[PDB]
Nucleic acid binder design. Structure first.
Lengths: 834, 848, 50, 222
RNA sequence: CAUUGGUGAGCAGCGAAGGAUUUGGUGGAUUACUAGCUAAUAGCAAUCUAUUUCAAAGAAUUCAAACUUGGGGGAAUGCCUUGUUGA
């Protein structure tokens, strides 16, 4: 029922730090602020880790063998993760701002550039168990003079050479007996050094500086040691080198400037292989894959990632996430995609299973406030603050309609008719509901009556009435069809600010500014019951709050509500750090989730640190800006007191935590929450939980396998359902033969009908037995059709996943087969040539 | 006695154990090595944060400790280990069987005195090396020269001299030659301690009466004699701040400070450590600071300061008494009840038989307060009646905690030994709450429970009654009289729907809670001594008295499992965080891990010491147990969380791998008649079908800039025959009329490779390559796997060479190949039949 | 732009406008993003638009 | 943050500045606090300009001029991005050298920007006034020290001191000897009349961060 | 008659060698614990100096440089740019 866990973080591709490839080159590890997303680019499957830091990540490094993953945030706090387990092995504090991590190419020991010191530690084995203190130190070198900005291992693992704001590079040997072989330093640059790299036979060293110069060092004569033989320069005027990388087997130098450019040189001899433009912001990180074919570029301003194959100039991927600008959410009527409406004036259709954006629409000028689909997943509607509401056709990608008012108010919420003929939008500038027809572009009516702005709209589908709820402290139900045109108001205790309607259409759930979810019947306007939701809310102290979180009431209500598709639970979320999952017939909460434990937002903690508070003021409300070494990162583009408009630079405050929208998924037991760090997607594993159903002393996996070996398929399937073990259901499901499928599917019990429907849907969207799954679906729908058509709400989010399977992965095989058949008929039937 | 799931992490909550600690100076900073059973721990001194702990437990207990700059010499049973940063950098095994008793390092020599009065002197090998390594000599003290060796000291400015102080006299040994040089006049008392004074030649000697002898060594004459009466002197320290003070810590709990110039006693700190646990076992002034670190045997280490004087001219006469400064501590007695206090596995509650409730920390060992038993001022108006001699509560025998309403009212309910009521506690303030909860039938609180929402507390007494108190206002609501023996377990569902109780009349009673009815009354055989409720699966477990664990589903209301196999009483047990295992520790010194689905014991540990509490983490990662002796909490981890664990039966031996590791790899193809798809991503077919337009959208907007000089063969210059392999394999497959290897390589090929080879087939001559390719695809469609891939390969062939075979239509070979193709494709239209039916009926069912 | 951001994007919208933009027949695969997947295959114009 | 010391010219007041916002003007000898300001913008330096009574601190962008009590008197719209302040005390001139590669002399009695001079060489890495001569020796990132004057819009004389950036310079009271340390771990003792370097310590076993010379010819290096 | 207004005088009740309110200071926590210093593959920590030096390496935009300005008018004299005379 309600065992959710943090599955995915969707809609954020890269924010800040270090972008890594897998050793095979198939997976791409990128840091969102705390967590780390991993994209498997071949199988098209992403995930993100459940653990998270307390501050933004500054470093990532994965082992060669793909076993261990060290992620270091800002200010030292490393976490060592077991990778193929997805589980945190150890926490270790390095107390200075760590600039770089890198394992050795052997794998045995890792280096760490932290301060002006080079630290070398030994890795813990993964085949062993957890220790109190697994990190055993190797050495700490302290030759440099200022902060160390880069770190590179030799190909054999016996040399490291580092790079620092000393304007200098330095070779250390790992072994004390090879100190004398390599104990040296390299001077001569002018601004910094930003990279130092070995050749593929380590007899040449290339060192690149922030000034824009590459020195080729070689161990030659004029007994003789380490001259500069060549000084090549990039002749960029305003651009500065921001990130360098080097693949030594193919001799590739990939440089990324602060103008947007990246250049690829060959470098024993400095030939411009390519010069391209990632964007119009700085380029903040470069990486290569092990073969040397893919180059991963990342920028932090606007937060984008670009994986580029450079032999044929081809973008493998070009994605751009979002941070603190996501005003609304919707699912496709499937578990396929999520459509987000974001403050930049953009709408993005994101996939789920491979967390990338499939499409972007960019026609609204200002921020897009809300987005809905029709009662079909081909057309969506969006409502924005430029005073317009537009329709979009997701087959030929065009806004075919743009409805506007007359007196140009700016629209906040919208709602679209099930029978897709009517779109009604409500604003806060006018508090009348404006309703347009969809086919003809005209506006039908302005439903008036609300005193004070309209906060939420919704269309009750299975009877088609309109529920509009407003700061009037009033719900109002309009019946706008059938020649009557009649209203009925309901009065609530506070000004309502969220609304949802049951799948039946029989009840409305409202969410008020007093901290109450109320639930009303809609035939008779009487109140059915309310959930009081004010004490199960985690509110936070801001860094600039002069009052306690206990007394603060900016965040003790919910501003988004969604009924489940059963109709039994509500998800709820507002301007606070907790998302709540409630149970309507029992008016008691099932669970509470804590959306972000990142101290670099604001409303996260309840109790700040009095060591940070001085008698001057908080140590965290001091301008750390003008200490910076960059004119562009030092200036302040802000406006006094503005919020919620424009870029994250235009407000001089720490971006708060909030959840802007929530929905339940239509097909699987998941829910998505559009929040300040992205789209948090929570989902359940019937694989991992043990939740049986009508057990007994005899029901056992051994007894079930005994029943299969004694050929009692109905009994084996029913025992596997009562054990509710996923591998057991899968074993017996593939173990029964073809000729007994209709008998078994007839004599299956009505209590285990929805369980077998859920199992077939999930297995079929990821399985290769299309014939077996279709035979099973045909037998079940044949045997038990009237039961499902009767219990249309118990089987909604199971038959929806089954429809998804049929349309997504069976109709495509049918398409290919029919095309081949008709092309063969034309090739073999028609006259030839000459 | 090893395990297969759990593995010991560390034992949490100990500070000291009565072995005299040692102080080690680093640069200008100090650390403190304290002994805790077999491991030691290295504490900072400016803050008392736990820096280091020993990484491997010793084979026996640690007798002595000493600490040079970076190195720590720990003398356990027969050996001496030389550790640095917790890791054993050298071992020094002695050549006897008698245990090591004392240990003193100085210079290049390490002097270790085993208990039969023989001192082993070890020497550094090279005078640059860091610890003594080699055997050098074996001195001995016979009976005619001295009694049992009390201590081994070294005085400053003594070339190769080792001051061995015995129970009768003080000896000096030359350690290089190995020759005694001096024997003091025999003291008429028994000497217990020695301590080198920070002046030359002077050692202080504490006896078993009240005497501290200031004894010279250049002359051999008792310079001073300071009498503590009616005490045994246990630890001596001097001051090196610039004031001439002395600290005499007694074996009664007292610590007395003398000024040696005025011959005065400045002060006496009374009862700092318990007399019953040794008293003061070590006191040390830090070197040049007015800070004394005193450690006892009651699992506590303190340190005090001497604030400077309040006068101006007088100064050393008006000395302020020593005030308190930092300290760490734990439990003195073993712990009684533990509980995980949140879902992060950050905090433990631990209530112990010294009547103290602590809040230990599993993240940082300096976050662990003690919860304060300081009552609240009444809300009625009367005066609370107790003793005016303040005391601690009786010991705790049950605890319930619920974090749903934290920081708003109380969320712990504790049941104390032989009292008639429970207490509320508050984990926010770490204080007691303002409500106490009575039973109302003269019965002791035998068990307690809390609602999930944090509103209700259920108290089950020792006469059957269940009282239900609201926790915000701590006010009584209900009372359930089903049992007439005691009530040994209460629980409420997560939906506040049903409520289980279980009691010593062998009775389980399932009540409703939203109504106030009885749903059922189950009677088992034996009495019932414990109940654990897993709410996520609605299964509870009852530990009985015919030595079994009865697992009962609460909804269908009957016994589903009955785990047998314990051979004595069942002390404690708990569920897995997901509902799959029950871990049960029992009084036959065993810990068994039973599996709930298959029903059998999958793991068994034998412990040396009986285990009285066992609690899984609320997260998956930790197991926490606690035993009969030992003042800590043993922490174990999950190999099962980082790996997979087989589920067999082990216990009768020690004391179908699909089903074992409970994973199931799906069949590649069930029948040889049913269709399948490819084993891979479902995007390979769409990419092959639309391989050109996706690359066209991937290419950038503008042209990139290049140079003019470039190597033409740059790819081949990236440094470090006759036929093609695909065509060769197709040719051999045509020769042998077997294309299986060709189809293996075609499924193997990547998107571009496939398009490249299929475009570069040969299509001019009597078309052998096209005929062989279509023959291979017909063999694949007869093989009935990779159906999407063979259909998409034929579509690619028709889009590349459609014009060639269209022009050369009705040629015999291509006609025959296409006829066989059409035969098998006709044979496989049934998939479209299936899809049409399922889509139409599903649409009708869902909408209409 | 500066005024809207300063005023915390509450404002009153633009009056209206019109513009007769053009379109071009392309596959929607090439119309959408740069990524290994896709979601629609048809052209960019209707059959009555061609 | 890390503080920053200035003494008055009488040697009777002390002006400390911390990198965060703490600016304190105190009497140091009778233990008084004349003015304490918790400015929040990162402050770089500060000088008592003519008395104990007025002092100018350099802030995140603009230089500010404060009274003897913390009453802010002026903010200088023309002194953008300064890190080095100074005061020619007979000429009543506040000299500010910044990150903009400019050098500005502002007459503090009238209120008038006497001169704006464009150092070509980019952000200034050190600065010290020759007191006997009242001429500003700046030290650039190239390694050149430059003697500057507010009438000539050209450097009076350029000296190549060190390889790579100059770290700190300091001129003797008598106006004859300049000490300059540069980030190539080097320290030069230069003569200023006739401009002949005297002697050049070449391998300091860390770069020299600060130099100062007393009124007895004592030479202090940090 | 009430006071859901203040100031006092007494009970009933609670009630173990007392009780209540306010308040200065210090300690420990408020993020998840791998020891101090330095010139650092080691040394010091009771000291770095009567080895603290030498050898090596190390010098573009022939100066590209305020990306750093509240709005309008101007700018004698300055400053910048371009040309010119004379050395």
């Amino acid at each position: 029922k309600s065992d959710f866990k943090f599955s995915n973080l969707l809609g954020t591709v890269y924010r800040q730090g270090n972008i890594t490839f897998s050793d095979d080159g198939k997976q791409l590890l990128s840091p969102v602020g705390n967590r780390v997303s991993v994209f498997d680019l071949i199988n098209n499957k992403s995930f993100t880790f459940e653990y998270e830091h307390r501050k933004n990540i500054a470093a990532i490094d994965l082992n060669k063998q793909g076993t261990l993953l060290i992620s270091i945030d800002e200010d030292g706090r490393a976490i060592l993760v077991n990778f193929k387990a997805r589980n945190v092995l150890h926490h270790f504090n390095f107390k200075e701002k760590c600039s770089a991590v890198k394992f050795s190419p052997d794998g045995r020991l890792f280096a760490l550039a932290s301060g002006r010191f080079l630290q070398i530690w030994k890795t813990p084995d993964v085949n062993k168990d957890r220790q109190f203190a697994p990190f055993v130190r190797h050495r700490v070198h302290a030759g440099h003079f200022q902060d160390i900005t880069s770190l590179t291992w030799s190909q054999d693992s016996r040399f490291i050479l580092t790079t620092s704001k000393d304007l200098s590079a330095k070779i250390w040997s790992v072994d004390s007996e090879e100190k004398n072989l390599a104990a040296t330093t390299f001077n001569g640059h002018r601004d910094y050094v930003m990279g130092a790299f070995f050749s593929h036979d380590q007899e040449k060293i290339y060192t690149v500086s922030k000034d824009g110069a590459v020195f080729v060092w070689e161990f030659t004569k004029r007994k003789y040691s380490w001259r500069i033989t060549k000084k090549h320069f990039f002749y960029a005027n305003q651009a500065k080198v921001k990130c360098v990388t080097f693949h030594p087997a193919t001799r590739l130098l990939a440089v990324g400037f602060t103008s947007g450019e990246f250049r690829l040189y060959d470098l024993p001899d400095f030939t411009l292989i390519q010069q391209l433009s990632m964007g119009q912001n700085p380029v903040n990180t470069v990486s290569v894959n092990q073969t040397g074919e893919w180059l991963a570029f990342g920028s932090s301003k606007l937060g984008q990632l670009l994986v580029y194959e450079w032999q044929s100039e081809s973008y493998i991927l070009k994605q751009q996430g979002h941070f603190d600008s996501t005003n609304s959410l919707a699912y496709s009527p499937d578990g396929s995609r999520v459509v987000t409406a974001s403050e930049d004036g953009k709408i993005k259709v994101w996939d789920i299973t491979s967390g990338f954006c499939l499409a972007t629409f960019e026609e609204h000028t200002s921020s897009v406030t809300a987005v809905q689909f029709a009662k079909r997943g081909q057309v969506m509607f969006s409502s924005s603050l430029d005073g317009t509401v537009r329709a979009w056709d997701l087959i030929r990608y065009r806004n075919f309609r743009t409805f506007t008012g007359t007196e140009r108010i700016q629209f906040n919420c919208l709602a679209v008719d099930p029978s897709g003929e009517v779109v009604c939008a409500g604003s806060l500038d006018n508090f009348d509901i404006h309703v347009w027809s969809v086919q003809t572009g005209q506006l039908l009516d302005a439903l008036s009556g609300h005193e004070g702005p309209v906060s939420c709209l919704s269309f009750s589908q299975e009877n088609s009435v309109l529920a509009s709820a407003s700061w009037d402290k009033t719900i109002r139900i309009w019946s706008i069809f059938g020649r009557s045109q009649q209203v009925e108001p309901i009065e609530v205790y506070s000004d309502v600010l969220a609304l949802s309607m049951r799948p039946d259409g029989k009840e409305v759930a409202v969410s008020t500014l007093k901290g109450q979810i109320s639930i009303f019947n809609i035939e008779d306007a009487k109140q059915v019951g309310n959930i009081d939701c004010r004490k199960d809310i985690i509110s936070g102290r801001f860094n600039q709050d002069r009052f306690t979180a206990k007394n603060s009431e900016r965040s003790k209500f919910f501003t988004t509500i969604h009924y489940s598709f059963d109709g039994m639970a509500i998800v709820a979320g507002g301007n606070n750090n907790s998302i709540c999952l409630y149970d309507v017939p029992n008016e008691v909460l099932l669970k509470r989730f804590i959306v972000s434990r990142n101290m670099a937002l604001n409303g996260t903690l309840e109790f700040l640190n009095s060591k940070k508070m001085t008698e001057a003021g908080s140590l965290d409300l001091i301008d750390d800006a003008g200490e910076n070494s960059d004119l562009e990162d030092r200036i302040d583009n802000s406006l006094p007191g503005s919020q919620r408009g424009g870029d994250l630079s235009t407000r001089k405050m720490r971006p708060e935590v909030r959840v802007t929208s929530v929905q339940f998924s239509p097909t699987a037991n998941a829910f998505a929450a559009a929040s300040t760090e992205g789209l948090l997607i929570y989902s359940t594993n019937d694989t991992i939980l043990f939740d049986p159903f009508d057990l007994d002393v005899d029901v056992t996996p051994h007894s079930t396998v005994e029943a299969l070996r004694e050929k009692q398929f109905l009994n084996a399937l029913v025992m596997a359902f009562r054990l509710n073990e996923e591998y057991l259901i899968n074993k017996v499901y593939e173990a029964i033969p073809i000729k007994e499928i209709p008998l078994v599917a007839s004599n299956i019990p009505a209590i285990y009908l929805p369980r077998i429907l859920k199992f077939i849907g999930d297995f079929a969207i990821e399985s290769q037995h299309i014939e077996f799954n279709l035979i099973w679906i045909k037998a079940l729908l044949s045997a038990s059709g009237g039961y499902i058509n009767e219990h249309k709400y118990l089987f909604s989010t199971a038959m929806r996943s089954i429809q998804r399977f049929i349309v997504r992965v069976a109709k495509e095989v049918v398409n290919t087969t029919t095309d081949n058949k008709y092309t063969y008929r034309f090739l073999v039937s028609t006259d030839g040539s000459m | 006695k090893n395990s297969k799931i759990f593995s010991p992490f560390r034992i949490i909550g100990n500070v000291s154990n009565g072995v005299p600690f040692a102080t080690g100076t680093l640069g200008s900073t100090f650390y403190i090595v304290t002994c805790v059973g077999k491991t030691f721990q290295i504490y900072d001194a400016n803050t008392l944060h736990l820096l280091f702990v020993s990484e491997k437990e010793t084979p026996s207990s640690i007798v002595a400790l000493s600490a040079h700059f970076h190195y720590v010499y720990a003398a356990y049973e027969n050996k001496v280990g030389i550790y640095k940063r917790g890791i054993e950098e050298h071992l020094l095994e002695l050549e006897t069987d008698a245990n090591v008793e004392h240990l003193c390092i100085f210079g290049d020599y390490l002097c270790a005195s085993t208990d039969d009065n023989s001192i082993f002197i070890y020497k550094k090998s090279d005078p640059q090396d860091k610890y003594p390594s080699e055997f050098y000599t074996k001195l001995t003290v016979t009976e005619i020269q001295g009694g049992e060796i009390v201590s081994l000291q070294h005085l400053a400015t003594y070339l190769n001299k080792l001051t061995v102080v015995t129970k009768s006299n003080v000896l000096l040994f030359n350690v290089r030659t190995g020759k005694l040089v001096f024997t003091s006049n025999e003291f008429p008392d028994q000497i217990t301690t020695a301590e080198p004074a920070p002046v030359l030649d002077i050692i202080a000697l504490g006896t078993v009466t009240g005497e501290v002898i200031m004894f010279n060594m250049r002359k051999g004459k008792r310079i001073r004699t300071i009498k503590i009466p009616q005490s045994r002197i246990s630890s001596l320290s001097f001051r090196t701040d610039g004031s001439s003070h002395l600290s005499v810590g007694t074996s009664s709990g007292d610590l007395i400070f003398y000024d040696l110039d005025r011959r005065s006693r400045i002060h006496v700190l009374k009862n700092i450590h318990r007399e019953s646990y040794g008293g003061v076992t070590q006191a040390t002034f830090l070197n040049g600071q007015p800070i004394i670190v005193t450690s006892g045997g009651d699992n506590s280490l303190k340190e005090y300061v001497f604030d400077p004087s309040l006068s101006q001219g007088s100064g050393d006469v008006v000395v302020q008494p020593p005030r308190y400064l930092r300290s760490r501590g734990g439990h003195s007695q073993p712990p009684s009840y533990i509980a995980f206090a949140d879902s992060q596995s950050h905090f433990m509650l631990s209530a112990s038989k010294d009547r103290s409730l602590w809040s230990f920390s599993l993240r940082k060992d300096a976050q662990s307060q003690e919860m304060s038993q300081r009552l609240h001022k009444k809300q009625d108006g009367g005066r609370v009646g107790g003793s005016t001699i303040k005391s601690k509560f009786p010991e705790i025998v049950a605890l319930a905690i619920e974090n749903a309403r934290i920081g708003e009212w109380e969320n712990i309910i504790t049941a104390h030994k032989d009292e008639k009521f429970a207490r509320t506690w508050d984990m926010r303030n770490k204080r007691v709450g303002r409500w106490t909860f009575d039973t109302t039938d003269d019965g002791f609180v035998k068990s307690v429970a809390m609602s999930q929402c944090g509103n209700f507390g259920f108290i089950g007494s020792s006469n059957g009654s269940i009282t239900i108190y609201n926790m915000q206002s701590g006010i009584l609501r209900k009372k359930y009289k089903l049992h007439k023996r005691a009530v040994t377990g209460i629980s409420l569902d997560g939906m506040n729907r049903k409520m289980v109780s279980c009691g010593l009349d062998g009775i389980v009673g399932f009540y409703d809670f939203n109504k106030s009815t009885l749903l059922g009354k189950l009677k088992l055989d034996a009495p019932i001594t414990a109940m654990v409720y897993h709410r996520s699966s609605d299964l509870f477990a009852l530990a009985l008295d015919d030595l079994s664990i009865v697992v009962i589903d609460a909804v269908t209301q009957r016994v589903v499992r009955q785990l047998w196999g314990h051979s004595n009483r069942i002390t404690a047990f708990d569920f897995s965080p997901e509902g799959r295992w029950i871990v049960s520790a029992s009084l036959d010194s065993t810990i068994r891990t039973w599996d709930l689905p298959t029903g059998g014991c999958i793991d068994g540990i034998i412990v040396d010491n009986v285990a009285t509490n066992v609690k899984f983490s609320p997260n998956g990662d930790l197991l926490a147990t606690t035993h009969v002796t030992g003042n800590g909490i043993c922490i174990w981890t999950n190999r099962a969380q980082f790996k997979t664990v087989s589920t067999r039966t082990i216990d009768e031996s020690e004391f179908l791998n699909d089903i074992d590791f409970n994973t199931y790899t799906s069949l590649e193809q069930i029948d040889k008649e049913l269709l399948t798809l490819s084993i891979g991503p479902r995007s390979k077919m769409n990419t092959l079908l639309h391989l050109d337009v996706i690359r066209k959208r991937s290419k950038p907007k503008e042209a990139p800039k290049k140079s003019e000089k470039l190597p033409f063969f740059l790819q081949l210059s990236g440094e470090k025959g006759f036929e093609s392999h695909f065509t060769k394999q197709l040719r051999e497959g045509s020769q042998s009329k077997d294309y299986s290897s060709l189809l293996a390589t075609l499924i193997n090929f990547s998107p571009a490779a496939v398009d490249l080879e299929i475009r570069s087939l040969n299509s001019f001559e009597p078309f052998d390559e096209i005929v062989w390719f279509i023959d291979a695809l017909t063999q694949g469609l007869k093989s009935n796997k990779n159906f999407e891939l063979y259909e998409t390969f034929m579509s690619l062939l028709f889009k590349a060479h459609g014009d060639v075979i269209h022009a050369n239509n009705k040629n015999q070979d291509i006609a025959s190949a296409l006829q066989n193709w059409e035969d098998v494709h006709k044979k496989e239209d049934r998939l479209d039949d299936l899809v049409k039916f399922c889509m139409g009926v599903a649409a009708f069912v869902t909408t209409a | 732009y500066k005024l809207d951001v300063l005023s915390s994007v509450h404002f009153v919208p633009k009056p209206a406008s019109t513009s007769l933009e053009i379109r071009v027949e392309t596959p929607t695969i090439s119309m959408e993003d740069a990524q290994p997947l896709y979601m629609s295959n048809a052209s960019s114009l209707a059959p009555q638009e061609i | 943050g890390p503080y920053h010391i200035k003494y008055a010219k009488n040697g009777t007041h002390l002006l400390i500045t911390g990198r965060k916002g703490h600016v304190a003007s105190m009497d140091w000898r009778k233990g008084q606090l004349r003015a304490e300001l918790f400015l929040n913008e990162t402050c770089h330096s500060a000088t008592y300009l003519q008395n104990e009574q007025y002092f100018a601190v350099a802030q995140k962008k603009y230089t500010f001029i404060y009274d003897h009590e913390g009453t802010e008197l002026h903010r200088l719209k023309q002194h953008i991005e300064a890190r080095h302040l100074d005061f020619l005390p007979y000429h009543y001139l506040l000299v500010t050298a910044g990150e903009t590669g400019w050098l500005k002399y502002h007459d503090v009695s009238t209120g008038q920007l006497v001169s704006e001079l464009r150092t070509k060489a980019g952000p200034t890495m050190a600065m010290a006034q020759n007191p006997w001569n009242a001429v500003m020796h700046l030290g650039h990132s190239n390694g050149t020290v430059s003697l500057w004057s507010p009438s000539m819009p050209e450097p009076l004389v350029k000296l190549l001191s060190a390889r790579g950036p100059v770290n700190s310079i300091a001129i003797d009271r008598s106006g004859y000897y300049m000490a300059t340390t540069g980030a190539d771990r080097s320290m030069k003792i230069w003569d200023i009349r006739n401009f002949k370097q005297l002697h050049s310590v070449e391998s300091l076993p860390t770069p020299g961060t600060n130099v100062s010379i007393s009124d007895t010819g004592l030479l202090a290096l940090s």
